């Protein structure tokens, strides 16, 4: 099972854990943490306007993102 | 040491009860001599490379 309680920890964790890896998508974040799917793409969309992640090629199922360098 | 590549240039025909196994004459590179006959389960054409481990079998035919 995957937790979905917004206990103020997930948002801070993902914001400080994005630089750990380069490829960010629903398939890898499920392995990374117990994410139920909604926050999986909501967090990525909310971090898109920030300069942390750079887009490469977006698709309906998934979108490709890379780190700052 | 067990791994030694060899070459096959001719075929002795399609053998085997079911016909799915071919028998061809082999020829090693490091030794131009020592021509052996081995049963190959795959389709073999002229001038094709073979990889073989148990180099001392000298198989004649398959029943």
């Amino acid at each position: 099972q995957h937790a979905t309680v917004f206990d103020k920890s997930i948002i801070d964790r993902i914001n400080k854990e994005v630089p750990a890896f380069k490829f960010i998508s629903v398939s890898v974040l499920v392995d990374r943490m117990k994410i139920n799917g909604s926050l999986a793409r909501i967090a990525i969309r909310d971090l898109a306007e920030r300069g942390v992640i750079q887009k490469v090629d977006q698709h309906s199922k998934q979108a490709i993102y890379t780190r700052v360098p | 040491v067990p791994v030694k590549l060899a070459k096959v240039i001719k075929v002795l025909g399609r053998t085997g009860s079911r016909g799915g196994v071919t028998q061809v004459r082999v020829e090693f590179m490091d030794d131009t001599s020592r021509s052996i006959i081995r049963n190959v389960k795959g389709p073999v054409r002229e001038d094709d490379i073979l990889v073989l481990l148990e180099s001392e079998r000298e198989a004649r035919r398959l029943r």
Partner: protein, 203 residues
């Protein structure tokens, strides 16, 4: 130079770079594992894996087919998807770019090394005709080696991604990278070892 049409410079730069792959180089990749040359068209550069041509008219016409195209053809399994090449091409493209993102070397080189390492060397055909119904050790041809490697990789990817969150492209990429090197975590390599050990046992 440009015309009224947009004509993006990516295509022009690709043509200048001796028509490399979609996003990977073509000049500098060759089969390094011995005993599988003259049967994989690594040098035949094609912008897309798909090629609607004749691949079965001749006895050995299959040997000149593109290795990526043959793998897409192998991925055509599961008659639910028998005939959906666009899905297979997208999955292969996503797997290849993920491999490039993971490791810097050419994903085609990863692919060629994976199929070469997976390809069985010693098999065991059945004598039949009742009796002891035993089996005898037999070597196999390079073309059948590629066929076994492609089938084992595809069936392993389908089994791994049959019921899981991970995508089919990701599972295929994981299988290819795990088969290109020796890590003992590849289902295709396990079947390779199993076929070898049973062949030596009945030899």
């Amino acid at each position: 130079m440009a015309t009224s049409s947009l004509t993006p410079g990516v295509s022009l730069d690709e043509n200048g770079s001796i028509k490399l792959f979609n996003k990977f180089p073509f000049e500098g990749v060759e089969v390094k594992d011995i005993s599988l040359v003259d049967y994989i068209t690594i040098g035949n550069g094609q912008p897309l894996p798909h090629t609607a041509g004749r691949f079965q008219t001749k006895r050995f016409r299959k040997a000149r087919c593109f290795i990526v195209e043959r793998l897409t053809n192998s991925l055509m399994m599961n008659g639910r998807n028998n005939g959906k090449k666009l899905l297979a091409t997208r999955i292969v493209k996503h797997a290849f770019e993920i491999i490039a993102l993971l490791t810097d070397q050419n994903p085609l080189q990863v692919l060629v090394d994976a199929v070469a390492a997976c390809g069985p060397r010693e098999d065991s055909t059945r004598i039949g005709s009742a009796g002891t119904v035993r089996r005898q050790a037999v070597d196999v041809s390079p073309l059948r080696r590629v066929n076994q490697a492609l089938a084992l990789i595809t069936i392993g990817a389908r089994e791994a991604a049959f019921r899981n969150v991970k995508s089919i492209s990701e599972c295929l990429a994981e299988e290819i990278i795990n088969a290109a090197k020796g890590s003992s975590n590849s289902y295709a390599i396990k079947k390779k070892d199993e076929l070898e050990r049973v062949a030596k046992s009945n030899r």
